[PDB]
Design a binder for this molecule. Structure first.
Ligand SMILES: Nc1nc2c(ncn2[C@@H]2O[C@H](COP(=O)(O)OP(=O)(O)OP(=O)(O)O)[C@@H](O)[C@H]2O)c(=O)[nH]1
Ligand SMILES: Nc1nc2c(ncn2[C@@H]2O[C@@H]3COP(=O)(O)O[C@H]3[C@H]2O)c(=O)[nH]1
Ligand SMILES: Nc1nc2c(ncn2[C@@H]2O[C@@H]3COP(=O)(O)O[C@H]3[C@H]2O)c(=O)[nH]1
Lengths: 404, 316, 342, 71, 71
């Protein structure tokens, strides 16, 4: 099992705490020795994320056996396996937050068997433990099978709880950097948008087109789009009459949650992957590349933040399944949210496509774009005062020309 | 001897084509005696555009005219300059321009010329506008080489020295014109890169929020370490040293390089900028780069440096 | 010994404790007699090096080697070996101090101690300095040998990680709060149109928890430039005297017509004053009127022992309140005209 | 391309169901409950994780903490 | 005892001289000089480094830099 002078594995592990911690090589290196110490056949690492307020566990390192290399055990972003938080031993570990081990899988309850068909493995024994940041779980590490015995004993639990201190430290500093990386950008976009919304009074169309153009870099996305609704509640008398007399049958389409017709009169879209092409389309046709999917006309009714993970496999919305460009560019992720104007009235819809890392949107990219749209919704006070000024001035001119 | 192919490129509006003129007109095929044929219209357009832009920026910068009556004059100008022809400066134009420049209010705007965009040579021109407006004026050679125009296309120049055959190409410095650089990349012997020393507190024409020194450094670092030009050598040129000498005292270096400290002189920061423009090279000792200061309008320094450059090209 | 002190970074990173236990070992390995630690910070554009651990020796404890914020020694980085090291960003080894041009006996008169040999190095995060460590006074040889200079570097590789973690955690702390103040100020600025006196009272009051202060004050300036004809007559007729006070960089006269002040220790006690007297507990020092003459960001470190201004000592309040640190900056309105001072 | 998971073209899941979308947040209360548990990295930010402004106003008697019963 | 620094009043200092104060922040830019050699924690944030655009648009020829000058 070991001797005392033989514990130079401590020095071998400390030798890599020198510089530029990649946070992927170090975990692999400690697992490749923990596999030998425990006398197990396979080890794996699942990572934790949250979408739509619901937790998920996605694999990051798979089949890390003894004498293996890094490049054949790193899971690409689009070849993952995603588990809900209630199914399997992994879900049980994440819910209970304590180390578990099953001497026999078949007799035990809530043992799933989905992976045993994809990867044709038998999974006779399981031992798992979580790693915490303090009240929060950050990853799960599992060991499968035993080299030459019935099951894992208690001494192996002692070994794991002793050598897990070198990974509780690596995984925690990889988590802080992400939070810093998101807070910086959240501060910057608010500051730079406040620079451009206090420069001049003008109409709503120009203000959004000067506030969204300045923050291209901070939102690393390929394309995004904004659509503006119409605010005319009640029409004149000479337009209602044809309906109440037996012509032009009444409206049949959808309605906002306070009563209106859902009509987009302007659409702004930005393309930032091939070459910058900013365009404005008045009165867009119902086959514009943003409006076909039916998502921006579903957000306007319910008013719910919607997050989609694999668009070409969704059934409810029927996105496109072919490239939309000469080069091969296809939709893979979508996120949409509404804009409100201090009286719980929807004024527009914003949509973002295809994050620039290949990975789907998560919590730390929901909060940023929720704060952006909150600020944009609050900032609609200025365009109204423009109209009020441009009416007061004309009324004053008329009444001053009446006295002359 | 067998053939020499030189390419000139660099940041836009840096005086690349001024070297082409200062070489071709001065040395080979003779000067242009009938210079007025183009220089009349060119200088008239430059001098009109400069004083139009200054008054257009007056309102933006909220500076108020020195005298009340001046407020009338500008208006007249902005109406009567629209329906005028090109390359003509009638007395009605010259009188208004001279009267406007004879003010203590326009000087306030002209002192702060970093915020907006004006041609740099214009400050030398308009002061002697009368010399232009007098009939029969034929420009001086120094006035000839201070004109301005947008170098756009690819042009072949044939310098001669050391009994060699030369072919010089130059290209536009804007972002759009950068696509055309690829055609002349293949099969070259040397490359020349141009930098303007004065532009440490200015902004790009295309993008309003990007500095110019940073743009030049990012442009340089890309091709400097590339393997396409590994075989060939690179020659660096620094222009606008006169305006650099003038300005370098006026404003600090902290705006462009945030962490600089000390007191600025015409030579203390020169090595700073040169070492920061040469550290970007990856191969420290495999390849070497040379940079020289240059005033394009002058001829003495051109003769001092161009022959040495050709000799160094010969040495290899 | 190394597995211990890795068992101590499990939660709530302890910058003081773990570095102390590293230094207690590094002092024994090198046969040195003392060790230290200097921290790096910047005030109003200039850099300096404070003190955080002093005179650590192999058998000391944590209580007799931790320096509180009041018993400090601050070195500008153009004085001494410490400044030379923190400026050059390289290791320094000094066999004898009688010859080095860079040396100071200032720290030897206070502590009654004599130094002969020195060995020091910086600690780097990327391109920035975070600290400096010293290994004064070797006990057996004439000076530090050349074989110790590699033990030093190869053994400080573990303390480098801890100090980098501390520095990173500190930067996450001061960027979380910058988003919140902006968001919760926009929230109360975009509620309705109002005059200036009410915006600066709604917005400065709802972010009083993120700003970790005890008192702060805001002063507003008059915005009228040209006077009336019936007021310029007395001056031109010998009836009065021309103005002679300070002037704002655009010519206006400096007079405050409102002062909003907040007290945040003990009682909330918000207040407004319609016309401040000649001696208010804020305007009396003279800093708010020196800031208005020329727009400067000012930062005083030891207020009771300054000479240019006058922060008179003795508590202003019954509970006992002495000013010790002050910061003040102007407010500009996109037209380059001062509107107030905070 | 083994890929170590035998899946290519997109993520796979054990079970599928109707989509569920998150709801907005309106009230945005300031205060927080008292804090329990181990600390971990990334906490102790002054402005956040607190009720009101200070402890003294909440419990005015707490100032006399060091004093004994009799006084 | 005396906190091991033998000073109790306040921060002492070797130097003396006239105070120097900072200038206000007038103009801002989106650009930074190109990166140096060595990097540490917190130096990879998107949008906080470079010129705000990918290097392809500024230098189109660098797109297909894999293929040499033969074609
Ligand atoms: N004062 C001064 N101006 C200079 C000097 N060198 C060049 N210039 C200016 O540079 C201008 C000519 O540069 P450009 O015509 O723009 O040539 P370019 O560098 O190829 O830039 P583009 O034409 O836009 O492609 C002249 O009008 C001069 O004002 C110099 O040494 N001193
Ligand atoms: N092929 C393979 N399967 C694993 C590995 N680690 C865990 N699993 C399986 O993945 C399953 C996921 O949910 P489970 O029900 O907890 O039981 C788990 C094991 O059957 C591994 O390293 N290789
Ligand atoms: N008494 C004492 N002096 C120290 C210690 N560490 C550094 N110094 C001295 O303090 C001085 C501060 O700057 P210096 O002049 O570069 O050289 C330094 C040493 O002489 C210490 O631990 N104890």
């Amino acid at each position: 099992l070991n001797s005392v002078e033989e514990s130079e594995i401590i020095f071998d592990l400390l030798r890599d705490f020198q510089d530029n911690l990649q946070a992927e090589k170090c975990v692999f290196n400690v697992m490749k020795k923990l596999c030998f110490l425990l006398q197990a056949d396979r080890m794996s690492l699942f990572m934790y994320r949250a979408r739509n307020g619901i937790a998920e566990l996605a694999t990051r390192l798979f089949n890390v056996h003894k004498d293996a290399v890094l490049e054949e055990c790193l899971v690409a972003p689009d070849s993952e396996i995603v588990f809900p938080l209630d199914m399997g031993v992994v879900g049980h570990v994440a819910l209970s937050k304590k180390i578990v081990n099953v001497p026999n899988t078949e007799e035990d309850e809530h043992f799933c068997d989905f992976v045993d068909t994809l990867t044709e493995y038998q999974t006779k024994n399981i031992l798992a433990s979580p790693i915490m940041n303090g009240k929060d779980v950050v990853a799960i590490i599992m060991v499968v099978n035993k080299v030459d015995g019935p099951h894992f004993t208690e001494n192996d639990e002692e070994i794991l709880l002793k050598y897990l201190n070198f990974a509780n430290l690596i995984m925690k500093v990889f988590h802080l950097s992400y939070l810093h990386n998101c807070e910086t950008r959240r501060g910057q976009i608010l500051l730079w948008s406040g620079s451009k919304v206090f420069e001049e009074l003008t109409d709503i169309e120009r203000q959004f087109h000067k506030a969204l153009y300045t923050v291209r870099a901070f939102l690393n996305c390929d394309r995004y789009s904004v659509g503006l609704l119409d605010m005319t509640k009640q029409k004149e008398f000479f337009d209602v009459w044809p309906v109440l007399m037996g012509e032009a049958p009444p409206y049949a389409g959808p309605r906002t949650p306070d009563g209106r017709e859902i009509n987009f009169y302007k659409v702004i879209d930005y393309i930032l992957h091939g070459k910058e092409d900013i365009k404005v389309i008045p009165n867009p046709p119902p086959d514009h590349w943003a409006l076909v999917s039916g998502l921006p006309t579903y957000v306007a009714q319910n008013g719910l933040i919607c997050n989609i993970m694999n668009a070409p496999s969704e059934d409810f919305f029927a996105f496109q399944k072919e490239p939309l460009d000469e080069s091969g560019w296809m939709i893979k992720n979508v996120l949409s949210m509404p804009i409100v104007n201090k009286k719980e009235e929807i004024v527009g819809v914003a949509t973002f496509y295809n994050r620039k890392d290949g990975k789907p949107f998560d919590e730390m990219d929901e909060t940023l774009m929720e704060s952006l749209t909150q600020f944009l919704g609050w900032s609609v006070l200025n365009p109204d005062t423009y109209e009020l000024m441009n009416k007061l001035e004309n009324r004053k001119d008329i009444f001053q020309d009446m006295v002359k | 001897a067998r053939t020499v192919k030189l390419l000139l490129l660099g940041a836009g509006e840096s005086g690349k084509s001024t070297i082409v003129k200062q070489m071709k007109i001065i040395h080979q095929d003779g000067y242009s005696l009938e210079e007025c044929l183009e220089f009349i219209a060119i200088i008239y357009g430059n001098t009109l555009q400069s004083i139009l832009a200054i008054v257009r920026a007056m309102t933006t910068l909220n500076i108020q005219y020195g005298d009340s009556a001046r407020q009338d004059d500008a208006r007249k100008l902005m109406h009567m300059a629209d329906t005028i022809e090109e390359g003509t400066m009638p007395k009605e134009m010259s009188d208004i321009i001279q009267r406007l420049w004879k003010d203590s209010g326009i000087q306030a705007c002209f002192d702060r010329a970093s915020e907006y965009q004006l041609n740099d040579s214009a400050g030398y021109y308009l002061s002697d506008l009368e010399r232009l407006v007098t009939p029969g004026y034929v420009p001086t050679e120094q006035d000839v080489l201070r004109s301005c125009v947008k170098t756009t296309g690819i042009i072949e120049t044939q310098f001669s020295f050391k009994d060699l055959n030369f072919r010089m190409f130059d290209v536009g410095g804007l972002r759009s014109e950068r696509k055309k650089w690829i055609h002349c990349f293949e099969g070259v012997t040397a490359i020349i890169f141009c930098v303007a020393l004065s532009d440490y507190d200015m902004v790009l024409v295309e993008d309003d929020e990007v500095n110019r020194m940073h743009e030049s450094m990012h442009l340089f670092n890309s091709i400097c370490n590339n393997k396409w030009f590994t075989d060939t050598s690179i020659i660096l040129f620094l222009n606008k040293k006169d305006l650099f000498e003038e300005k370098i005292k006026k404003s600090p270096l902290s705006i462009c390089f945030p962490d600089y400290a000390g007191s600025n002189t015409y030579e203390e920061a020169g090595n700073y900028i040169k070492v920061q423009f040469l550290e970007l090279n990856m191969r420290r000792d495999v390849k070497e780069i040379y940079s020289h200061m240059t005033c394009a309008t002058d001829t003495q320094n051109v003769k001092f440096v161009f022959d040495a450059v050709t000799d160094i090209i010969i040495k290899e | 010994a190394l597995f211990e002190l890795v068992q101590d970074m499990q939660e709530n990173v302890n910058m003081e404790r773990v570095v102390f236990k590293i230094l207690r070992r590094l002092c024994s390995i090198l046969h040195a007699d003392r060790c230290s630690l200097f921290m790096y910070r910047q005030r109003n554009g200039v850099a300096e090096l404070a003190t955080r651990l002093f005179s650590v020796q192999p058998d000391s404890v944590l209580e007799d080697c931790l320096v509180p914020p009041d018993s400090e020694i601050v070195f500008p980085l153009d004085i001494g070996v410490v400044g030379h090291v923190a400026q050059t960003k390289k290791m320094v080894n000094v066999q004898d101090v009688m010859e080095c041009p860079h040396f100071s006996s200032f720290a030897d008169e206070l502590t009654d101690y004599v130094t002969r040999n020195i060995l020091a190095t910086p600690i780097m995060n990327g391109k920035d300095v975070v600290a400096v460590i010293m290994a004064v006074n070797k006990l057996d040889g004439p000076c530090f040998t050349s074989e110790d200079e590699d033990v030093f570097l190869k053994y400080l590789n573990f303390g480098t990680l801890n100090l980098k973690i501390y520095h990173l955690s500190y930067l996450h702390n001061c960027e979380t709060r910058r988003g919140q103040v902006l968001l919760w100020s926009a929230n109360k600025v975009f509620e309705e149109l109002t005059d200036i006196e009410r915006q600066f009272h709604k917005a400065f009051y709802t972010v009083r928890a993120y700003l970790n202060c005890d008192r702060y004050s805001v002063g507003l300036l008059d915005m009228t430039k040209e006077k009336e004809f019936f007021d310029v007559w007395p001056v031109l007729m010998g009836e009065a005297q021309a103005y002679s006070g300070p002037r704002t960089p655009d010519g206006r006269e400096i007079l405050f017509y409102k002062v909003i002040d907040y007290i945040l220790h003990g009682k909330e006690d918000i207040k407004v004053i319609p016309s401040p007297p000649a001696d208010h507990w804020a305007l009396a020092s003279g800093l708010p009127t020196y800031v208005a003459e020329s727009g400067f960001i000012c930062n005083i470190m030891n207020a009771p022992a300054d000479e240019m201004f006058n922060f008179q000592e003795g508590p202003l309040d019954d509970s006992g309140w002495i000013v010790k640190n002050v910061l003040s900056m102007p407010i500009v309105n996109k037209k380059e005209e001062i509107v107030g001072v905070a | 391309i083994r890929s170590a998971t035998r899946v290519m073209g997109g993520p796979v899941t054990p079970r599928k169901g109707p989509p569920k979308f998150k709801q907005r947040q309106t009230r945005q209360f300031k205060s927080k409950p008292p804090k329990k548990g181990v600390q971990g990295f990334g906490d102790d930010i002054p402005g956040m994780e607190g009720l009101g402004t200070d402890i003294t106003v909440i419990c005015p008697w707490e100032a006399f903490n060091h004093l004994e019963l009799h006084e």
